[PDB]
């Protein structure tokens, strides 16, 4: 149910020997470039068909509004 026989060596430090907070604002320019050069075909597939449909509706409704005016 939960047993896999194994062989490894692990080392570990204490919580009160390390710096807890400063590893968040570490290299935020490098962190941002990694996320957007790897997830730019998943947002071109999420926002793409929505920006292109909203452009069609606003153009359709601006040509039947100027055709009813006398």
């Amino acid at each position: 149910k939960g047993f896999v026989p194994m062989k490894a060596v692990t080392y570990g430090l204490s919580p009160f020997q390390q710096k807890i907070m400063p590893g968040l604002w570490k290299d935020l320019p490098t962190k941002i470039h990694h996320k957007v050069s790897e997830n730019w075909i998943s947002a071109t597939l999420l926002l793409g068909p929505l920006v292109g449909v909203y452009s069609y509706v606003q153009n359709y409704q601006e040509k039947e509004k100027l055709s009813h005016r006398y």
Partner: protein
């Protein structure tokens, strides 16, 4: 006691003469405790220690 002292006074005559004690060597490199762990997993051994 008085017979051993006169033997060592004429047998131990040639050992070195540096004036460094042990306390000057413990104090310039002290020992510091750290909380940490080591775990060695094997699972083919029958008992754990």
């Amino acid at each position: 006691h008085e017979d051993i002292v006169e033997q060592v006074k004429k047998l131990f005559t040639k050992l070195s003469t540096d004036p460094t004690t042990a306390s000057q060597l413990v104090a310039k490199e002290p020992a510091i405790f750290t909380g940490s762990e080591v775990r060695m997993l094997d699972d083919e051994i029958p008992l754990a220690q």
